[PDB]
Amino acid sequence: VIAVKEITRFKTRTEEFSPYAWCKRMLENDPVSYHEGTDTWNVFKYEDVKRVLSDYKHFSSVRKVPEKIQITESDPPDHRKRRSLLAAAFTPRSLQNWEPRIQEIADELIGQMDGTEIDIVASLASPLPIIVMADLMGVPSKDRLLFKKWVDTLFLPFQEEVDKLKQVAAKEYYQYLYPIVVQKRLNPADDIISDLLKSEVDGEMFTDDEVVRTTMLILGAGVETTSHLLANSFYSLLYDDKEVYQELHENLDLVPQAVEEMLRFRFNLIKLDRTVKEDNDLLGVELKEGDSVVVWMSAANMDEEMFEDPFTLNIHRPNNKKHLTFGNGPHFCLGAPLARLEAKIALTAFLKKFKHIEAVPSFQLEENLTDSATGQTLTSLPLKASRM
Numbered sequence: 001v002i003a004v005k006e007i008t009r010f011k012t013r014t015e016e017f018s019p020y021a022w023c024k025r026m027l028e029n030d031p032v033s034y035h036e037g038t039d040t041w042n043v044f045k046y047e048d049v050k051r052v053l054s055d056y057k058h059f060s061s062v063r064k065v066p067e068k069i070q071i072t073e074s075d076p077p078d079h080r081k082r083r084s085l086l087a088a089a090f091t092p093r094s095l096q097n098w099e100p101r102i103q104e105i106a107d108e109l110i111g112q113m114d115g116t117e118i119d120i121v122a123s124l125a126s127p128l129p130i131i132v133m134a135d136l137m138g139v140p141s142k143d144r145l146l147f148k149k150w151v152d153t154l155f156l157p158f159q160e161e162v163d164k165l166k167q168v169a170a171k172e173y174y175q176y177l178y179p180i181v182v183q184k185r186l187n188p189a190d191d192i193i194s195d196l197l198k199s200e201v202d203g204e205m206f207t208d209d210e211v212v213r214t215t216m217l218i219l220g221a222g223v224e225t226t227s228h229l230l231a232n233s234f235y236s237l238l239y240d241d242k243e244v245y246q247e248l249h250e251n252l253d254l255v256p257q258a259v260e261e262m263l264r265f266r267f268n269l270i271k272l273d274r275t276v277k278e279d280n281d282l283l284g285v286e287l288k289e290g291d292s293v294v295v296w297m298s299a300a301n302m303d304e305e306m307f308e309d310p311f312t313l314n315i316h317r318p319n320n321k322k323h324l325t326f327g328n329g330p331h332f333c334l335g336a337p338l339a340r341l342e343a344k345i346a347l348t349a350f351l352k353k354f355k356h357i358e359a360v361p362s363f364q365l366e367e368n369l370t371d372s373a374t375g376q377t378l379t380s381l382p383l384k385a386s387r388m
């Protein structure tokens, strides 16, 4: 694995969190770039990133976990089958049915917020995805705090005393959930575990172990990323364009468009890796089998060939939803509708309750950021809210 910081070599976390000047420089001066220190080819332009992510015949997701559940690191023809197995639990019917459940959870969390000082990461951005996933999975509401404790340890964290805590949590999680999975095979309900147990593609079906382990992968894909989107949205409403909050407060139908502009502009720096599978000179440079390619979706999202005035936050830009933050092609995020729905529901609920927010002047961004797979992520974000 190549960390972003090995390529950017930025001095501060802040420059990764707000990397606009670097993206511009790469897009304009070196859009298909060889980085000798990591032996990577780096792709920045929108059209090139989109093509690389479509062209699984030349750019593989297999680098260098039971196989049936390894969806991200697989290529066609197995990838399609493995994705379809999981997709049975994320149908549009299910997503529509989830909306009132997610609403109720967001209402409970916002319910507990008071003109007092709120840590939006601790009070909303972290817990909402976790509590939602517990509910959607079919974990009994009585065990929510216990489940959340394991998820916090495993997926927001954060010592080779840490390794030990995670080993213990993973075992506790597995021995909690496995008997639930067993019970649900015999008595299905309307929940993710039950839908996974019934899923069948070309005669392939999940074992109970595979169901449990798929739930752990779902958490690993969805918790920290969704929390990053929620926290960054509030960051942007506090520090990027202060008028946007008022616009959304007076017109809640703008919230989905605002979420797409946060995915475009405030999800930094997200990249994906591929490995060349078939020799090719289609990016205009010849790459041979085994070469490493890094596609920078954060930069593609700032490409003026696709997005007008790309270094400005603009929720009215007509084509923000063409961003590449969820990928493109065969591996495009299976969670994207859920992620979009959680963010719309959370923001809307907060906007209903609070007329104004304001930044806390003592907050230092550099001291409240940590690494993640999808870019620098906020460990807290304080704000003052006016119930007004």
Ligand code: HEM
Pocket: 061, 071, 072, 073, 083, 218, 221, 222, 223, 225, 226, 229, 272, 325, 326, 327, 328, 330, 331, 332, 333, 334, 335, 336, 338, 339, 374
């Ligand atoms: C803002 C939130 C999210 C972001 C930005 C995000 C981003 C991504 C990206 C970029 C990929 C493509 C990886 C690749 O091509 O190598 C991906 C794949 C995936 N995402 Fe997400 N994701 C998010 C939330 C979620 C959630 C909530 C779930 C599940 C509940 C989830 C499940 C998946 C799965 C299963 C894949 C693999 C799909 C495949 O390989 O066919 N994601 N996501």
